[PDB]
Symmetry: C5
Subunit: 221 residues, 5 copies
């Protein structure tokens, strides 16, 4: 059996390594979260551009980053790091996705992989909701309530049918979960909890549901 | 055997998930606690209304939420969330009860299920006590001591007999436990510990009693 | 094997239950400690009164609580709770003692039961010391040093012989342990560490001595 | 099975020993880190001097410490400790390296040894980068951006070919990892994170990669 | 298998017992540390006095405590506790040593016993160093640097030979370890780390060396 000294020292060293790595990466962390939230959001667009431009990933990355810049303009400072991370993740998105899924698989066998895929799915859903909210605001031109109203309109009576295979994000995710995640993320984290909240709530809900369903449900008697 | 790295990372990730989920849901937590305390309290009333109105759960939910509003009036701000959660829990009370009991069963085999049922029973008892206190205060019209006096009067000499099958809440719960829970909850949490205190004390007492009774009692010799 | 999720959730829920229960009972905790310290101290007196008054526990409890009041007078506010707890523990002392010993037995097989009995024995010893100190102060009438001097006089040269079977408290307890416990309790907790200090030190010493004696003593060679 | 008391006391005593030892060594810790960062950096230079001066380690240590002084001058206070530690580590570098690698081997079987060797390799890489940055700054004579530009120039288009077997440091280490480590270390620790950041990130990355690769990668299907 | 409840409650109760005992003994702790550091330091002197005065431990304790007083004078307040503890430990030194070694043996089989013996050996070494420092200061009569210079002079060129079997303390202990322990203890704890530092560092070094040597040293290849 392993002695107490080795277990304690391993725990202590792993804790130091994790804390030090987060401390080192902290100046980049928020930028990375944004650049990568966007990347998950717009990955199908990147694939379409890939198909369009002769199957050159470099061209697709260049055009997509230029498009992102043209979305910002029309504050590059403190966002050039975000653009750089977005370009890197567009260039090596498949590798980073494989790494994340493989780490999750190591943590939890198949539940972790499904959790990662669900988190990507939720990010895509929330991003489409935000894009639709911005479009509707522009149309009404001639933000708190607009996102919520758009979310209700998108999935409330329009479950999956109209605009086929395009609102299939919400078909796999709970309405209440996404709504509460968005609101709690905005209140708690702020403009980034808009994506963190739904992701955390959806992933936690799926993990806990899968974990709890292992035992049979209690009998009424 | 599982290595230290996996155990530590699983513990750390679960802790982060739990803390982040509580942080996200925190703006709603108190409202949810109230809306759901009420729902456990008035569930038999909801079932009676269900029976009355042609067995339509939607009609019962609408009427019961309208009744709750007519109890508030005669401050909707910062309480519309409470009303919304109450309506949702009235609509899907059985599903949420099944989920809570099934999670408790996963945590503790049968002790958790009994703990959840006891917590519901204690909430119902305290709610009936509070309703009787308010009624007696209205009659004396022509709050600290009134609740305590009503609690003593309800179960002190009236154990279970008069008003049959109606004060059967206290038949399964300790007097001292409920009284101390009410007082400590009011002092500690405030107007919500009125229900948290009795629930926490009753659940903890049942769990610890069941746990301790596993070994035989110590012999006097 | 139990998974990490269940172990972590059980630990977290038990910690929440314990912390919440202490938070709820906190307004009563000190009063309960006093009312129950006294009860352990005066239990033989209660048994003698029980024998005197026709074997009626209610009469013994009434007379003993009245005697406690006549000791306070000759500040009832913030002490009526103490008197109430004292009366309850006088009424159901055997049940509470059985519960404490049975919980200790569940924690530690036989070491816990012996620890509880030792804690009661130490409380009785310190209480007799305090009573003798007060009596000697009254005689000298015609507090820090008086208790210490009385403790030295009681057991220093008078080990167990004079006043037979009456100073048998100190025959089972270390002098240094009681003295240091009294002093450290007064300095740390204040007028209640007068009983907590000796109890904690005696219980910890017995537990650690029993634990350490399991292995053979190290050889000099 | 080991009882809870022994495990808890062992953990507590080891924690006290570690915390007390760090508390005692704290006045020296930073100096030691520097004197030893330098020693890892300039070890090949020390070996060349060893070969030059008749294979006398004492002569090599003396000359190398004198050279370090001549680098400082052209603030000895609060640095004489650094010079002393540098001289000691130059005198007994192999023994300290063996001790560090052997402790790492005890913690992690072969992963720890590889981690230590990687940390030394990363320190050597960053030190060569810093030396080249200082040289280029002197040439441009006739610091934040200069180090980064030098790092890009050293390995960006010059992977390993020009100046053969001399930029073989970067051949085993990620560009992004070193760059992010340098930046995060400067921002977090300051002029010492210049070496801590790359070391922590490289070691953590290798450990986590080796740990995660144990399970097969998740299948796309 | 033991359930989670018992493990958690045992850990929690042991933590409470340890914390409460340290809290109670805290007013005495520093005095005890000093009175007992001295006792380990002067134990051979006590044995010589024992041999001189007809083998009467009481006489030896009386004379040795009187000698300690004559060292203080030529501030008894806040030191009478120190003198009392010194007298007690002189009276029952063997019993306390047996208890400490037996507790250490229970914690760690043979490594703990060796650690305790090493701690005593280090205390004796540092005490002899301090005595020699004071003597040399008195001779130079006609403190920071004097202790360090005396330490270098005692063992630097005089390893064990001159004054035979009298500087055999340093023959078993590292120079660097003692020096760093003294300096770090003075800086961290203050005039008591003069003994704590060397003890903590020596004990930790021996424990970690013994622990690490269990696995074979890593091969160079």
């Amino acid at each position: 059996p392993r002695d107490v000294a080795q277990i304690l020292l391993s725990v202590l060293f792993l804790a130091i390594m994790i804390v030090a790595c987060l401390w080192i990466v902290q100046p980049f962390i928020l930028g990375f979260a944004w650049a990568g939230t966007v990347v998950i959001a717009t990955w199908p667009v990147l694939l379409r551009l890939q198909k369009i431009m002769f199957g050159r990933r470099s061209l697709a990355v260049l055009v997509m980053t230029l498009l992102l810049v043209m979305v910002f303009i029309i504050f590059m400072v403190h966002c050039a790091l975000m653009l750089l991370f977005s370009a890197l993740l567009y260039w090596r998105g498949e590798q980073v996705a494989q790494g994340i899924r493989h780490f999750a698989t190591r943590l939890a066998g198949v539940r972790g992989d499904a959790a990662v895929l669900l988190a990507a799915q939720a990010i895509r859903a929330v991003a489409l909701g935000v894009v639709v909210t911005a479009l509707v605001q522009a149309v009404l031109g001639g933000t708190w309530g607009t996102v919520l109203l758009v979310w209700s309109g998108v999935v409330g009576t329009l479950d999956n049918v109209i605009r086929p295979m395009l609102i299939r994000m919400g078909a796999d995710l709970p309405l209440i979960l996404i709504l509460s995640g968005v609101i709690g993320g905005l209140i708690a984290f702020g403009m980034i909890g808009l994506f963190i909240g739904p992701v955390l709530l959806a992933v936690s809900w799926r993990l806990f549901a899968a974990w709890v369903e292992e035992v049979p449900p209690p009998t009424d008697q």
